[PDB]
Amino acid sequence: ATLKDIGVSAGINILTAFIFFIIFAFLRLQPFNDRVYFSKWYLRGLRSSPASGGGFAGRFVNLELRSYLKFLHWMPEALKMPERELIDHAGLDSVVYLRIYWLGLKIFAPIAMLAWAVLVPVNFWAHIIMAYAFTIWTCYMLMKEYETVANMRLQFLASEGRRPDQFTVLVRNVPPDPDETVSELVEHFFLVNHPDNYLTHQVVCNANKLADLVSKKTKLQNWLDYYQLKYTRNNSQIRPITKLGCLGLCGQKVDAIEHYIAEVDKTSKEIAEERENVVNDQKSVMPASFVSFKTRWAAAVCAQTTQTRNPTEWLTEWAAEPRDIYWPNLAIPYVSLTVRRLVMNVAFFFLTFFFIIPIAFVQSLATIEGIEKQGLLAGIALKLFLIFLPAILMTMSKFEGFTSVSFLERRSASRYYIFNLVNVFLGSVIAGAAFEQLNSFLNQSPNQIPKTIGMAIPMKATAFITYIMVDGWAGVAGEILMLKPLIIYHLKNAFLVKTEKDREEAMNPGSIGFNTGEPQIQLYFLLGLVYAPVTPMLLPFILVFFALAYVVYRHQIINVYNQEYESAAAFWPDVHGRVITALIISQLLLMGLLGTKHAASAAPFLIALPVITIGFHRFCKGRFEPAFVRYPLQEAMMKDTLERAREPNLNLKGYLQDAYIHPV
Amino acid sequence: ATLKDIGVSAGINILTAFIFFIIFAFLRLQPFNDRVYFSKWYLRGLRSSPASGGGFAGRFVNLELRSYLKFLHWMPEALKMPERELIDHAGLDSVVYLRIYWLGLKIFAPIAMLAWAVLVPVNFWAHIIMAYAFTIWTCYMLMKEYETVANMRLQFLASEGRRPDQFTVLVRNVPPDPDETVSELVEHFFLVNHPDNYLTHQVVCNANKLADLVSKKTKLQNWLDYYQLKYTRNNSQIRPITKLGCLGLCGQKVDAIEHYIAEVDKTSKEIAEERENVVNDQKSVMPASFVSFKTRWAAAVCAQTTQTRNPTEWLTEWAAEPRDIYWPNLAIPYVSLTVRRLVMNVAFFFLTFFFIIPIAFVQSLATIEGIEKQGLLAGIALKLFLIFLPAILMTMSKFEGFTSVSFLERRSASRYYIFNLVNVFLGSVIAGAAFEQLNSFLNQSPNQIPKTIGMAIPMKATAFITYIMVDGWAGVAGEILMLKPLIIYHLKNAFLVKTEKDREEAMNPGSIGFNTGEPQIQLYFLLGLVYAPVTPMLLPFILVFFALAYVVYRHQIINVYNQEYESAAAFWPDVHGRVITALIISQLLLMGLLGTKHAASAAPFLIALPVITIGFHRFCKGRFEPAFVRYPLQEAMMKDTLERAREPNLNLKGYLQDAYIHPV
């Protein structure tokens, strides 16, 4: 807890980060790892075969040129590409995700200086003065960024090339009719209610079974394809027991290779069968459709207007890019959605109970290891549950029924924020204590509310210091190493490869992961804002995370990560709101801090702060937020007119008709 | 406080109510008071001169036929006209305002039975069971009424004859341009962004000065018109000192009659001058306009769609009926609106501080008078501040800047609800105690929050019993007597009359007064809901108010009150939300009641109740609320098509062009 031990652990984590960077240098120099280190370039067609031509040198022959730039030159190079160039290279989503790291530096750097000029030197009424200044600064910066991101979104939307989503809406809950099919209902509705500019529509079908069958066929054909092409004839017929699959040489199912070619053909037979009962059956057709319009202005009108007296019927909303559409959830009834959200909300309480305890355990482990000196082990274990949590939260969001990957990632990020709020405040040590405080919370003395809770609710600064150093420093350095995609591609290009040329491409490294990366930024915003008026110690470590993560993620956005969708920064209102929450939480905790070190003499100002913050939030939600949720009709009309002038003869019908069919 | 004294005061108030009814009978029989007792009939052209022909008998010649139906027959007759007939007679607004009284009977009658079968007989865990049942019932009834009122609103909107507001929107904050006038800006914007169905527009001018001058001229011409036509030549030249006017024969200003005919002519000269500098000046033109569209569908689109990237510019909203438009507030800048609301919010805190104390004083007075036995005096004094409060709250709303009388009345009703919440809970005895607890609240022992507050916050049931009996029983009976409009017309038809035939008509009795009547209903909903699980005594008295007020107001809606606007029940979301607030407040207070008579064994269910209520509220705000705020596009299109079929050749331009010019 003393600065000596803090510096010792900091040194360990700094060394671990540098170690990761050193291995990164080596592995990025290897020509055979280039595929999974410069993925975006191959995806953009700007790089050829792995080693910019492929099959060259630069591997262990020269190791890593003994110097300092061998493992540090990627840093200034990441911070070299212009931001506008990154908008066209990676996308606006990734560029504004990077802006959150810069926002953190733009907020916590000035306030660190302020806190290191007031707290540590002249250590209360200064607490309230600082809190005020901190909130004002955070809010000013939040407003400035809301503005810039809003303008960037609108500029991006205007310049964007014709995408099918700009003309389409997703009508949901189309009321069932005994005489008309969903298709006929939709056509007739939008031909009488939106006559001037209705073009075509695409009814949503439940091709979920078919999709799964087709995916199973691909898996089955490539399961033991490695084994099938190991030496042909009769190879190792592994037996993945039918209960978890995987395994291998453990059950009793040998049959043929290629995961029992008979079963692969049976999947294909089922595919054909299902195809018939999914295309020509009319029961597959869900009460939903993708209505396309002749103009973007018409689609805007439809999306932001109520269609019928029942506001829970004919629910029209902007359609997502056909690649963002999460098709499995489009086959879920609207009535079910409500209950599914509730079920997952209460399952999330259980989930918070679940991970808090192992997180605390791993934090204790890290502490012990540091005191004794593995730190790398601590990292990988905490990293381990922090790669399960995003996945669980994502499956919970898929259950809830969001029909777009963007919204699923955004929901999972919101859930993760609650987990991080709970794990650092109410339920941080209460629900973190093995036995003891957990059951004491639910079973103690009568009442005893602000006694068991009020007393030191937000944990301790020292423990959080170690968290930043482990997860925010060494963690982001591990991200640059990109170990997992490397291993995956290694055990695919030499295993189940069987490509004619370049079809087996497991170099795709996914995206930034808004559902994981953003919650991290927000937990550090939380820690930073809450502790700022109390202890100025957390701010330095938080600032290093922001800077390090900015550069590591910039590198990854430019070199590796490829966007799976383009929301044009539609997630910014969520980011903004989460920083506003941190602000409010900080002020509430300062009301408690200066409610005990005090005489209600500071209370009038301590209660004005939250109101000011909420008022600012509402101003920002009325000025900048509408740009992210609704497409202005003037903007839509401008784009329409310009496009109809550049191309005076376009067949929008052809482009929009089959743009929203289930991929299968 | 004992039932003996309670019954004594009840008897007094019942007698006072009957006395009011007896005088009402007499005065309604008088042929010369018929004008201000059956006003709606003359306004509808269904009644001729005052006494259905005028100048007849029925006055003191026969007094009031000695019986019981002499003063009680108006009751079943009020409850005779069908509800649909009242929708076309008075309006939907008045019919759903009556439905709030019926909603109160539909909620508090079943729950009174429940509380009188559980509390008084078998008197806690029953408290929570009752609370649950009460909330479930209230919520069920609230949902049922939300549905009926929503359907009635939609049926009314569909049947409604062509009104100019159905095709128009109020665009506010039209950005200023150096080269274009507001008119040109508006025309060009809506000709490029809403090309298909833009018809005409009417820019808002600041004719506030002109309006005031014209109104002053009318006042000046009728001020001493009574005196001018008393005997002509040279009559009593009264001198209303120029500081408050009124007075009379007190200052030194004699000049001529007709309030100094020279000054009347000077007002007319100023009128002409201002007319020139308000019509042809272009600085009077405010940054706002009334854009009319060829279809109601287009106006719906415009109203419920965002127009430009700046969501605080080109703010298009459904226009109000030209008679509902409060023209003075249309000349107030949008930036000012925000600050004006804040200023009035803090002035409202001061106002709550203001009236609580006199209200408490008058309640004490009533108590003392009752104990000694005037009760009539108590009534008229409480009635007195309860006729100033609505006025103050209305002027505060006008300052805030609402451009429609409907919204002004709705805002004043919301403000009045906060006043009534504060005056019955936090600041009821705290801010009601002369000196003592007022200054103790702001200056007592350190902290001491749930000690000074928690201890018996919601006043006492006995005091509230007297309130219902005085304001809710005798108060509504005084309403039927209609004393004020009577006196006014009496001192106008014999004073400043000077009509050629029927131009001096001061029989108009205004409307129901949503800004006053509704807050009363809501305060009794509050009292009823909060005390229901605690003491079942309040419910009987509350029920009598609801029934009495239903019949008195039904009578007044059919016979006297005339609607000044038609919102088609647009205020119902507000009413609903205020009953939901009462529910939540009741549950919060039951959490405190069963948090002290307890063992947190009831707390899990006591905290589930508010969440259930908020969840229900959100369901109702997503299912029924959208009908009151947005016009469904299908409904708009249906009306449009039907109208274009009935009248295939209509000039909507003519009807819509000058429908939104300032009355002057």
Contact between A306 and B630 using a beta-carbon 8 Å cutoff: yes
Distance of alpha carbon B354 from alpha carbon B441, whole angstroms: 16
- CA proximity to A571, closest of A629, A658, A622: A629
For A173-279, strand residue ranges (E) read 198-205
- CA proximity to B469, closest of B384, B542, B374: B542
Quote the tokens at residue A527. 């820690």
Q: How many CB atoms lie within 10 A of CB A577?
A: 17
- Report DSSP state, residue B373: -
- Sequence-distant (6+) residues with CB within 8 A of A258 are A220, A221, A223, A224, A225, A227, A228, A264
Contact between A631 and B196 using a beta-carbon 8 Å cutoff: no
- Sequence-distant (6+) residues with CB within 8 A of B203 are B182, B183, B186, B285, B286, B288, B289, B290
Quote the tokens at residue B243. 């500081």
- CA proximity to A422, closest of A516, A350, A364: A350
Distance of alpha carbon B613 from alpha carbon B610, whole angstroms: 5
Contact between A309 and B154 using a beta-carbon 8 Å cutoff: yes
DSSP letters for B246-290: ---SSSS--SSHHHHHHHHHHHHHHHHHHHHHHHSSSSSEEEEEE
Distance of alpha carbon B274 from alpha carbon B211, whole angstroms: 10
- Establish if A599 touches chain B: CB-CB under 8 angstroms: yes
Q: Please return the burial class of B450, using the count of CB atoms within 10 Å of its CB with bins 0-12, 13-18 and 19+.
A: exposed
The residue type found at B415 is: R
Cβ under 8 Å to A: B residues 133-192: 150, 154, 189, 192
Contact between A189 and B630 using a beta-carbon 8 Å cutoff: no
Rg of chain B over Cα atoms, rounded to whole angstroms, equals 28
Helix (H, G, I), strand (E, B) or coil at B153: helix
The residue among B309, B317, B318, B441 with the most chain A CBs within 10 A of its CB, best to mutate, is B309
- Establish if A445 touches chain B: CB-CB under 8 angstroms: no
Distance of alpha carbon A16 from alpha carbon A6, whole angstroms: 15
CA distance A663 to chain B (A): 32
**In chain B, which residues have their Cβ closer than 8 Å to the Cβ of A308?**
632-635
- CA proximity to A119, closest of A477, A372, A354, A461: A461
- CA proximity to B328, closest of B257, B418, B408: B408
> Are the C-beta atoms of residues B631 and B318 closer than 8 Å to each other?
yes
Contact between B446 and A599 using a beta-carbon 8 Å cutoff: yes
End-to-end CA distance of chain B: 58
Q: Please return the burial class of A565, using the count of CB atoms within 10 Å of its CB with bins 0-12, 13-18 and 19+.
A: buried
**In chain A, which residues have their Cβ closer than 8 Å to the Cβ of B625?**
311
- CA proximity to A246, closest of A224, A267, A278: A224
- Sequence-distant (6+) residues with CB within 8 A of A113 are none
Give the method of determination: cryo-EM
> Are the C-beta atoms of residues B58 and B30 closer than 8 Å to each other?
yes
The residue type found at A240 is: P
- Sequence-distant (6+) residues with CB within 8 A of B2 are none
> Are the C-beta atoms of residues A134 and A112 closer than 8 Å to each other?
no
Chain-centroid distance of CA A415 in Å reads 11
Quote the tokens at residue A511. 């995206």
Pick the CATH number of B164-206+284-320 from 3.30.70.330, 3.30.70.1560, 3.40.640.10, 3.30.420.40: 3.30.70.330
Distance of alpha carbon B618 from alpha carbon A341, whole angstroms: 14
Distance of alpha carbon A253 from alpha carbon A237, whole angstroms: 8
- Establish if B294 touches chain A: CB-CB under 8 angstroms: no
Distance of alpha carbon B152 from alpha carbon B570, whole angstroms: 11
Helix (H, G, I), strand (E, B) or coil at B392: helix
Quote the tokens at residue B585. 């407040």
Distance of alpha carbon B104 from alpha carbon B524, whole angstroms: 9
**In chain A, which residues have their Cβ closer than 8 Å to the Cβ of B600?**
446-447
- Establish if A304 touches chain B: CB-CB under 8 angstroms: yes
Helix (H, G, I), strand (E, B) or coil at A570: coil
- Positive or negative CA dihedral for B418, B420, B423, B426? negative
Quote the tokens at residue A538. 């957390």
> Are the C-beta atoms of residues A578 and A111 closer than 8 Å to each other?
no
- Sequence-distant (6+) residues with CB within 8 A of B631 are A306, B157, B296, B300, B303, B304, B318
Instruction: Tell me the CB-side half-sphere exposure of residue A582, using CA atoms within 13 A.
Output: 31
Question: How many angstroms separate the Cα of A473 from the Cα of each of A1, A377, A483?
Answer: 19, 15, 17
Tokens 């919520």: give the residue.
B139
Rg of chain A over Cα atoms, rounded to whole angstroms, equals 28
- Establish if A210 touches chain B: CB-CB under 8 angstroms: no
Q: How many CB atoms lie within 10 A of CB B290?
A: 25
Residue spans of alpha helices (H) in B280-332: 296-303
Distance of alpha carbon A96 from alpha carbon A90, whole angstroms: 11
Q: How many CB atoms lie within 10 A of CB B335?
A: 10
- Establish if A493 touches chain B: CB-CB under 8 angstroms: no
Determine if residue A655 is left, alpha or beta; phi over 0 gives left, psi from -120 to 50 gives alpha, anything else beta: alpha
Quote the tokens at residue B640. 């449009």
**In chain B, which residues have their Cβ closer than 8 Å to the Cβ of A630?**
305-306
Number of helices and strands in chain A (H, E): 28, 4
Distance of alpha carbon B256 from alpha carbon B467, whole angstroms: 51
Distance of alpha carbon B467 from alpha carbon B363, whole angstroms: 7
> Are the C-beta atoms of residues B167 and B269 closer than 8 Å to each other?
no
Distance of alpha carbon A48 from alpha carbon A42, whole angstroms: 6
Quote the tokens at residue A570. 């539609």
> Are the C-beta atoms of residues A213 and A220 closer than 8 Å to each other?
no
> Are the C-beta atoms of residues B158 and B641 closer than 8 Å to each other?
no
- CA proximity to A304, closest of B196, B304, B315: B304
- Establish if A308 touches chain B: CB-CB under 8 angstroms: yes
Contact between B311 and A627 using a beta-carbon 8 Å cutoff: yes
Residues in chain B: 664
Quote the tokens at residue A263. 């079963």
Chain-centroid distance of CA A244 in Å reads 28
Closest chain A residue to the Cα of B615, Cα to Cα: A342
**In chain B, which residues have their Cβ closer than 8 Å to the Cβ of A573?**
none
Helix (H, G, I), strand (E, B) or coil at A393: helix
Long-range contacts of A155-164 (CB under 8 A, 24+ apart): A156/A87, A156/A92, A156/A568, A156/A569, A157/A568, A157/A631, A157/A635, A157/A639, A158/A635, A158/A638, A158/A639, A160/A568, A162/A643, A162/A655, A163/A321, A164/A292, A164/A319, A164/A321, A164/A322, A164/A655, A164/A656, A164/A659, A164/A660
Closest CB to B307: pick one of A196, A622, A634.
Answer: A634
Distance of alpha carbon A420 from alpha carbon A438, whole angstroms: 17
> Are the C-beta atoms of residues A660 and A168 closer than 8 Å to each other?
yes
- CA proximity to B663, closest of B323, B221, B203, B222: B323
Contact between A623 and B312 using a beta-carbon 8 Å cutoff: yes
Quote the tokens at residue B108. 């508090």
- Stretch (H or E) spanning B169: strand B168-172
- CA proximity to B287, closest of B165, B401, B183: B183
- CA proximity to A568, closest of A157, A259, A245, A30: A157
Checking chain A for breaks where C and the next N are over 2.5 Å apart, the residues before them are 123, 373
The residue type found at A322 is: P
Q: How do beta strands B168-172 and A198-205 pair?
A: unpaired
Helices B514-531 and B572-593, axial angle in degrees (round to 10): 30
DSSP letters for B73-99: THHHHHTTS-HHHHHHHT-HHHHHHHH
DSSP letters for B471-486: IIIIHHHHHHHTHHHH
> Are the C-beta atoms of residues B71 and B25 closer than 8 Å to each other?
yes
Quote the tokens at residue A184. 């006929």
Distance of alpha carbon A585 from alpha carbon A599, whole angstroms: 21
> Are the C-beta atoms of residues A350 and A335 closer than 8 Å to each other?
no
The residue among A624, A634, A637, A639 with the most chain B CBs within 10 A of its CB, best to mutate, is A634
**In chain B, which residues have their Cβ closer than 8 Å to the Cβ of A310?**
623
- Sequence-distant (6+) residues with CB within 8 A of A380 are none
Distance of alpha carbon A161 from alpha carbon A88, whole angstroms: 12
Chain-centroid distance of CA B433 in Å reads 30
Contact between A634 and B308 using a beta-carbon 8 Å cutoff: yes
Number of helices and strands in chain B (H, E): 28, 4
Q: How many CB atoms lie within 10 A of CB B655?
A: 16
Question: How many angstroms separate the Cα of A136 from the Cα of each of A525, A580, A616, B13?
Answer: 15, 11, 10, 57
| 3 state SS for A271-301 | HHHHHHHHHCCCCCEEEEEEEEECCHHHHHH
Quote the tokens at residue A572. 């910014």
Checking chain B for breaks where C and the next N are over 2.5 Å apart, the residues before them are 123, 373
- Report DSSP state, residue A158: H
> Are the C-beta atoms of residues A424 and A527 closer than 8 Å to each other?
yes
Distance of alpha carbon A126 from alpha carbon A536, whole angstroms: 13
Distance of alpha carbon A23 from alpha carbon A15, whole angstroms: 12
> Are the C-beta atoms of residues B526 and B582 closer than 8 Å to each other?
yes
Distance of alpha carbon A308 from alpha carbon A314, whole angstroms: 7
- Report DSSP state, residue A469: I
- Stretch (H or E) spanning A371: helix A334-372
Tokens 């110097």: give the residue.
A67
What is the rounded (10 degree) CA torsion for A364, A367, A370, A374? 20
- Establish if B234 touches chain A: CB-CB under 8 angstroms: no
Closest chain A residue to the Cα of B197, Cα to Cα: A196
Distance of alpha carbon A509 from alpha carbon A557, whole angstroms: 10
Distance of alpha carbon B638 from alpha carbon A554, whole angstroms: 54
Contact between A622 and B312 using a beta-carbon 8 Å cutoff: yes
Q: How many CB atoms lie within 10 A of CB A592?
A: 15
> Are the C-beta atoms of residues A254 and A152 closer than 8 Å to each other?
no
- CA proximity to B530, closest of B138, B140, B123: B138
- Sequence-distant (6+) residues with CB within 8 A of A61 are none
Cβ under 8 Å to B: A residues 625-664: 625-627, 630-635, 637
> Are the C-beta atoms of residues B476 and B545 closer than 8 Å to each other?
yes
Distance of alpha carbon A457 from alpha carbon B619, whole angstroms: 34
- Sequence-distant (6+) residues with CB within 8 A of A480 are A20, A21, A24, A74, A552, A555, A556
Quote the tokens at residue A380. 């990988």
- Establish if B312 touches chain A: CB-CB under 8 angstroms: yes
Q: What percent helix, strand, coil does chain A show, rounded to 5? A: 65, 5, 35
Instruction: Tell me the CB-side half-sphere exposure of residue B145, using CA atoms within 13 A.
Output: 26
Quote the tokens at residue B83. 């509800």
- Establish if A444 touches chain B: CB-CB under 8 angstroms: no
- Establish if B308 touches chain A: CB-CB under 8 angstroms: yes
Distance of alpha carbon B169 from alpha carbon A622, whole angstroms: 20
Distance of alpha carbon A47 from alpha carbon A39, whole angstroms: 9
> Are the C-beta atoms of residues A611 and B299 closer than 8 Å to each other?
no
Quote the tokens at residue B322. 């030209």
Per-position b or e across A384-412, b if 16+ CB within 10 A of its CB:
eebeebbebbbebbbbbbbbbbbbbbbbb
Determine if residue A176 is left, alpha or beta; phi over 0 gives left, psi from -120 to 50 gives alpha, anything else beta: beta
Quote the tokens at residue A238. 């592994």
Distance of alpha carbon A152 from alpha carbon A570, whole angstroms: 11
**In chain B, which residues have their Cβ closer than 8 Å to the Cβ of A311?**
622-623, 625-627
Domain ranges of chain B: 3-161+335-646, 164-206+284-320, 209-279
The residue among B349, B634, B638, B644 with the most chain A CBs within 10 A of its CB, best to mutate, is B634
**In chain A, which residues have their Cβ closer than 8 Å to the Cβ of B308?**
632-635
The residue type found at B130 is: M
Contact between B306 and A631 using a beta-carbon 8 Å cutoff: yes
Distance of alpha carbon A535 from alpha carbon A531, whole angstroms: 5
**In chain B, which residues have their Cβ closer than 8 Å to the Cβ of A307?**
632-634
∠ CA A62-A64-A67, nearest 5°, is: 120
**In chain A, which residues have their Cβ closer than 8 Å to the Cβ of B635?**
308-309
